Design an enzyme around this catalytic site. Structure first.
Site, PDB file in Angstrom:
ATOM      1  N   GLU A   1      41.770  18.119  25.679  1.00 58.03           N
ATOM      2  CA  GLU A   1      41.622  18.061  27.127  1.00 58.03           C
ATOM      3  C   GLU A   1      40.856  19.232  27.726  1.00 58.03           C
ATOM      4  OE1 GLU A   1      44.382  16.222  29.858  1.00 58.03           O
ATOM      5  OE2 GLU A   1      44.722  18.193  30.777  1.00 58.03           O
TER       6      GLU A   1
ATOM      7  N   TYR B   1      46.670  -5.123  50.439  1.00 56.43           N
ATOM      8  CA  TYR B   1      45.851  -5.869  51.366  1.00 56.43           C
ATOM      9  C   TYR B   1      45.966  -7.375  51.202  1.00 56.43           C
ATOM     10  CZ  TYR B   1      44.124  -1.567  53.211  1.00 56.43           C
ATOM     11  OH  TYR B   1      44.083  -0.348  53.857  1.00 56.43           O
TER      12      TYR B   1
ATOM     13  N   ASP C   1      45.611  23.084  26.326  1.00 53.45           N
ATOM     14  CA  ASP C   1      45.617  24.505  26.606  1.00 53.45           C
ATOM     15  C   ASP C   1      46.991  25.024  26.221  1.00 53.45           C
ATOM     16  OD1 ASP C   1      44.174  22.764  28.567  1.00 53.45           O
ATOM     17  OD2 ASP C   1      43.214  24.676  29.092  1.00 53.45           O
TER      18      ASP C   1
END
Lengths: 581, 315, 315, 581
Positions: C158, C67, C210
């Site tokens: 996590e 912008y 995981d």
């Protein structure tokens, strides 16, 4: 089917579809749609459970060879042209397959015309006899055939007759529903036949099934008025010749008909007219008489049908029904209906319905077929098969609808469906219904057992639950899971409430929820009630009450002291319906 | 760890057990057959990890639930699709918004900045000037404290940027405010905080999101549902009318949006004639509108023009 | 606002302009034709918002860049696809990791808990016991402070849960540690913090994710790339070998994963024979493995058995 | 194509494809694949730019009516059978369309056979004459036709002849590439014709194009040895009759051939033998003589081709090429190649190539066609069209390849492609190349201009840049953007360095980067150099240097004081190649 004039191959290329040959896929199948029936048509005559081997090798880019071994009685040397060509006219109004001869001829032709290699034929009449081999051709123009090889080949194990056809067509597609389905369809309906198929590239489906009971003898007849029309009278008169008790099956009704037309009960047969014909035709209409014949058709059979499927698939609950012979405007007919439910079938919906016309199958666009229609016109879910749509109930099913009649009402001018006749659907219906219920019973019974095992778990579930509500809420313990459980299967609970004091009031209450008559014992040492009925054994006594409560009755039995505590240690038996009976 | 004004109704879940057993069947509100019996037995697994682990502190989450459940046989879980229903059921029967029961979720309601100090209570064993990320209201909204209120307006903004840059330039001082970023749909942590100030403080709260209906729905997820609201609030966020006049670059919208516009109208949920009017503008203009876009018309612009400009004419 | 040891090389970007112009063409390392001339002009828009807005503080982000760029014509931007390249180019030419230049990103590197107080410096105008969400290292890693180190190990975990519950039960006291959650791929904020401790403190750091390769790649995004690492670190996280023996429920894996397994092997990036061995186990077992699953074998289990158990045999 | 014996419709249904009729889609198109050519074949004879209207209404479920208005000279009453039926044998070895008569006959037949409605025909010879209407039929068996209506219909604006055919086929598909493409294809190649098409349901493509220059006259010939084979000699001898300077175009070579076979230079023609034939055949092979004829074909034309496309599409740069007549083993041939580039064409890749055989089109499976092959066998990207693959370059193009020859080498036995003959591809190639280059020039020029505007912006870009490096780095200012800019377009920069002291040394340096001869002026008041060459005007003087530097030369011119500062205010002119010339 007309009796032409001058043009042969054209007749074909012009009816190149109304006949059955449009595309590569139906090209081949039509050939077999014949082949296999001539055979059954043959054997069924005097030669037993006929077996039929039918191959199809891949020959070249897009041509095919089709072998069709018979097993029938073979065919007379001077009768090949007549059975492998078809230029015949004129008779015969009896129940079979192909709509009048047009059969095999078609096949020969297409092969002869597409690829072109004559047409191999081989046959043996009986044990000791020559075995002839023929190479047939039909050279256009000159319609009559033209035999080309009549030698004598050595071997064959005499007694049958094989055809070998090469023709640019396409067997190949066997998935979507084409060939395998045809013989499988043919297989299931003609139990009295062994069908082995060896398809190009190597594989082998052997429909070797049985119960060698040849079909009921095909029979012939004269016609019945209603069903006769404009074309009929022209034929009747114009050629052969009293023309009432002679060619119109099932004397007083001869002289009574003549008047209602404008003819004298004695004038001569032929050359009557072209306008005095429309007057006698109704001379039948307005005077409905006795009845055509019942002793005239050959259903497949409530039993065989059953067999047909049970052997050629993998169902779970089946039902057959062969309804009495009904009749429509002149032509007699019988409809049989069989239905098979789940198993090897498809998981959800997609109901499959294979229709059967006078022993022939059908596998072309169900839309419109009186069969499919009827199938959609009635009940649905509230019967057993939960399937919404607006027509055709769906799930793991399979429906067979059969129709027989010396002549059959077909829609398109190429036997592919049945025209919605009032008196016919009015039959198929109560006929598809005829089992549509026997299924319900099963499901009503089957699904039922589920509602008998659901319970068995809500009684090894309702248990630990009110046991979780304990080692978690310091309240006494697992408070009679029984009263509730008994209220579930809704049998009738019998328990024993007990209170202690400077006395000992104990009450045995029982309450049902179904309607029976009950007998209840109870053994103890003495006692101090709502009417007893005591007998005594050894020392401790036995108090036997007698009650018969029903619906939602709730009665209560009472009594008193003697000793104490120890009492909580029994379980009172009954006699009817622990508790014996 | 408090949670007793609830642990009470949490045991009362049971009680409706014997009073339920001793006399008749056992329907709640439905029980009685297979899926309605089992769905119940799992009551146990429930009121078991809860009431017995409420006074011992420890608190856990959903995909852990699916694990601490692999303990109670004849009651375990076949899929983490159970967590909801049950826990979502509790919200309905014991009238206690999930969390109350000692449940943490999937996410982090961080991002908040303003002039008002506070503390929480449990877990252990300033807000005016903490750090940058500072306070991250975590998995709870009833562990409170206050006493310091020198700001008369709160702020609802969404962007891993607009809020950020609404920090540097600021706004926190000579312009009151209380900042709170949200990152997409704002659930528990956040919301029950927004509400907690629109009831216990009488302090206004406005939403400032992008243009996409995906933002105009973030006000409705704070406007009501989908204890979690602030209905008397307004949206000074990018409204279709406050961009027609404000030049601003744009962007073309797609199919999934136009089907989303006839959904926030042909389905009157908080569909006032004022969210219907500015929305109608969406149908017309036929274009989107980022949120940090003001940067196109000056960097010190948002912190100067838009906010105040639109903020004096409250409505 | 410091940033001068860089603002220096940031102007030096220019200098290679006249010394570049006065004598000949102007190739960097390539300039000279259309897309290579324009790609340059936008140098300006660059070194313009930067060096001239480095001493005035204010800092902004990517979709703002798109912008504040709609200002300089003959140089604006047609798509926010520019932000990268350029800014990603700066990382290569001025050897200054993006942020250095005063750039904030898309996300929030929150979630951290341990025994070590600290402060930052800019923006304004304890860490041992702050709150629950507490410190949220924001868009920078060089605004530092320390002096308090009574924990000898850091923790990489996590889950919007495992970490959470690794708080309640804790670990922060009688078991050293320094906690830091990550939420999916860890970028700047987070990483350059992990590294900052694996170099300026000699303090170890392990990863606990995981099982899914989608986690085994989160170690590699801290292991190296894709100033941002801690290579001398190990993974005590759910490794295929530390679950065969630990019972634990499981789950079936899909196509997108199996094609992901032959990618972390048929592409040797940090593919040691030890991440190759435990991975090979993945090929065998043919199943996944959540991270908070320990909860299946006791709630007070992770905080008791696994971590320590696996933690004594460092490797 | 044989001369049959006894069978008519069959011949069809058996060549029911080799002929052209397999499916519904090609059924119709084949009909027009004829219709339209007989017409051009007609008119092209003596009757000008022929226009052809060709409709096709939807008739029923899957049948169609096709109108084909002529404009030619109409056809003689006793010649209909001969042109609308085809049972002819025997001659004629000249250049046209359909491979020998088999044309329209086929059409009549299929229509006659599929639907069956005779076949409408209407024609007028000239202004005042009856206009006859015929209803033709071919009743099988009796091969010869059978006229059925020969009345006289009133009207028509006399001078042409329309055919109306109804036949179960399928026009309908006009997308994927079928019919519109055919006439469009036909359109572009036969410029000398107006083609209007009104397709069922209402629409109208008018290929009204022109440059009324009738094609080059089709011509006939005798054969040439090489290209004659086993079948030939049997024909030559067995029927008609020195048999060397009589039926084998382009005396001494008659008596010289006889010996090399084993025949005497005088023996009689016919009944020579069946084994003494294989000996004389090579009696030609081994003695290659003069040459067949060149004055024998009719290319479409380098020009017309051009027109053909430019008018019937929307291209941007085009190129035609009509190569001299080449020859292969006996049969003469000419190949023309045209290529058109981008515009209305397709965005990326998918190159479209429409092939053209002796004015007929072709739209059936490109694979194998000598055309497509050649197309793949050469160059590719490095020519202009950036397209990888391994064959067939792709992008927004369009290629036309034409072949002409009294007889044509086709692959499949149903004219659909050309057989890979050495001496032919060896031609098409350098022929497709013939333009493959003229394109390059365009692209090399076209794409070039881009590399002429890219620059124009790197000179209004290189500008503000070194202007951004100012209001941002407090260094004097925007330091001569010119030296650099000039080094870009690589012209030659001329500037003026200047230093001040207690004197005033100023140097004018110039350096090129391309090779020319330069003239350089410079006007001022006096001066105090590397060789001058002064002339004086008014007061202030003019110092004109003269240099010729090339490649990467860099020369330097100098001088001295007089006044001061003010000097920075000029721009020195030159003369050759500001600066005039």
């Amino acid at each position: 089917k007309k009796q032409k004039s001058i043009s042969v191959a054209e007749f074909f290329e012009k009816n190149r579809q109304i006949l059955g040959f449009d595309s590569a896929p139906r090209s081949l199948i039509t050939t077999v749609k014949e082949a296999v029936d001539n055979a059954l048509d043959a054997c069924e005559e005097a030669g037993i459970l006929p077996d039929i081997l039918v191959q199809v090798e891949r020959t070249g880019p897009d041509y095919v060879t089709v072998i069709i071994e018979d097993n029938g009685p073979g065919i007379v040397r001077e009768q090949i042209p007549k059975v492998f060509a078809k230029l015949l006219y004129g008779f015969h109004a009896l129940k079979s397959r192909g709509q009048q001869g047009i059969g095999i001829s078609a096949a020969v032709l297409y092969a002869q015309m597409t690829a072109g290699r004559h047409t191999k034929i081989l046959s043996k009449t009986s044990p000791t006899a020559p075995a002839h081999y023929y190479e047939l051709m039909i050279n256009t123009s000159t319609n009559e055939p033209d035999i080309l090889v009549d030698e004598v080949r050595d071997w064959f194990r005499p007694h049958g007759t094989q055809i070998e056809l090469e023709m640019r067509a396409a067997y190949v597609k066997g998935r979507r529903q084409s060939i395998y389905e045809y013989l499988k369809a043919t297989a299931i309906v003609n139990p009295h036949a062994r069908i082995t198929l060896i398809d190009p590239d190597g594989n082998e489906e052997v429909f070797e099934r049985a119960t060698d009971k040849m079909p009921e003898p095909a029979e012939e007849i004269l016609p019945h008025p209603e069903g006769i029309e404009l074309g009929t009278l022209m034929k009747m008169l114009h050629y052969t010749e009293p023309f009432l008790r002679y060619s119109f099956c099932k004397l007083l009704t001869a002289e009574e008909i003549c008047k209602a037309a404008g003819l004298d009960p004695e004038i001569d047969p032929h050359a009557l007219g072209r306008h005095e014909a429309r007057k006698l035709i109704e001379a039948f209409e307005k005077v409905k008489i006795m009845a055509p014949p019942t002793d005239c058709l050959s259903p497949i059979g409530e039993d065989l049908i059953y067999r047909g499927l049970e052997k050629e698939t993998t169902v779970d609950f089946i039902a057959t029904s062969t309804r009495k012979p009904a009749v429509y405007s002149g032509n007699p007919f019988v409809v049989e209906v069989g239905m098979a439910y789940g198993g090897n079938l498809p998981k959800e919906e997609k109901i499959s319905i294979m229709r059967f016309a006078n022993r022939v199958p059908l596998l072309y666009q169900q839309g419109g077929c009186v069969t499919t229609h009827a199938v959609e016109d009635i009940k649905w879910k509230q019967y057993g098969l939960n399937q919404p749509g607006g027509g055709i109930p769906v799930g793991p099913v399979i429906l067979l609808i059969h129709v027989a009649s010396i002549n059959v009402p077909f829609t398109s001018e190429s036997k592919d469906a049945i025209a919605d006749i009032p008196v016919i659907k009015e039959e198929i219906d109560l006929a598809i219904k005829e089992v549509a219920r026997k299924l319900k019973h099963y499901l009503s019974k089957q699904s039922n057992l589920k509602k008998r095992r659901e319970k068995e778990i809500i009684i090894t579930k309702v248990l630990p639950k009110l046991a979780a509500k304990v080692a978690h809420v310091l309240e006494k313990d697992v408070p009679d899971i029984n009263p509730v459980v008994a209220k579930i299967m809704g049998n009738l609970l019998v328990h024993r409430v007990i209170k202690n004091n400077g006395d000992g009031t104990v009450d045995v209450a029982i309450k049902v929820k179904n309607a029976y008559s009950f007998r209840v014992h109870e053994m103890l040492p003495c006692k101090v009630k709502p009417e007893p009925k005591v007998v005594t054994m050894g020392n401790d006594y036995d108090y036997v009450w007698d009650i018969s409560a029903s619906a939602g009755s709730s009665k209560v039995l009472s009594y008193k002291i003697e000793s104490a505590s120890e009492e909580e240690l029994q379980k009172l038996p009954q006699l009817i319906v622990t508790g014996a009976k | 760890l408090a949670r007793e004004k609830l642990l009470e109704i949490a045991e009362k879940i049971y009680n409706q057990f014997e009073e339920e057993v001793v006399p008749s069947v056992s329907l709640p509100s439905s029980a009685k057959t297979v899926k309605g019996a089992f769905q119940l037995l799992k009551t146990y697994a429930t009121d078991f990890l809860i009431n017995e682990h409420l006074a011992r502190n420890r608190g856990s989450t959903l995909r852990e639930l699916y694990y601490i459940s692999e303990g109670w046989d004849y009651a375990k879980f076949k899929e983490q699709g159970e967590s909801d229903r049950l826990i979502e059921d509790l919200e309905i029967l014991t009238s206690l918004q999930r969390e109350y029961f000692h449940m943490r979720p999937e996410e982090d309601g961080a991002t908040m900045f303003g002039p008002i100090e506070i503390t929480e209570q449990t877990k252990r064993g300033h807000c005016q000037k903490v750090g940058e990320g500072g306070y991250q209201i975590p998995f709870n909204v009833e562990n409170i404290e206050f006493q310091k209120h020198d700001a008369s307006m709160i702020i609802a903004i969404e962007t891993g940027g607009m809020y950020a840059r609404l920090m540097e330039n600021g706004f926190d001082e000579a312009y009151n405010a209380i900042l709170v970023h949200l990152k997409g749909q704002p659930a528990r942590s956040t919301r029950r905080i927004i509400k907690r100030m629109n009831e216990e403080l009488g302090i206004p709260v406005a939403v400032f999101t992008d243009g996409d209906p995906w933002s105009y729905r973030i006000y409705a997820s704070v406007a009501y549902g989908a204890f979690m609201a602030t209905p008397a609030a307004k949206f000074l966020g990018l409204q279709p009318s406050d961009i027609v006049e404000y030049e601003l670059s744009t962007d073309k919208l797609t199919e999934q949006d136009v089907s989303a516009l006839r959904s926030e109208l042909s389905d009157p949920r908080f569909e006032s004639d004022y969210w219907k009017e500015q929305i109608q503008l969406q149908l017309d203009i036929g274009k989107k509108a980022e949120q940090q876009a003001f940067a196109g018309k000056g960097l010190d612009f948002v912190t100067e023009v838009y906010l105040p400009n639109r903020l004096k004419e409250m409505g």
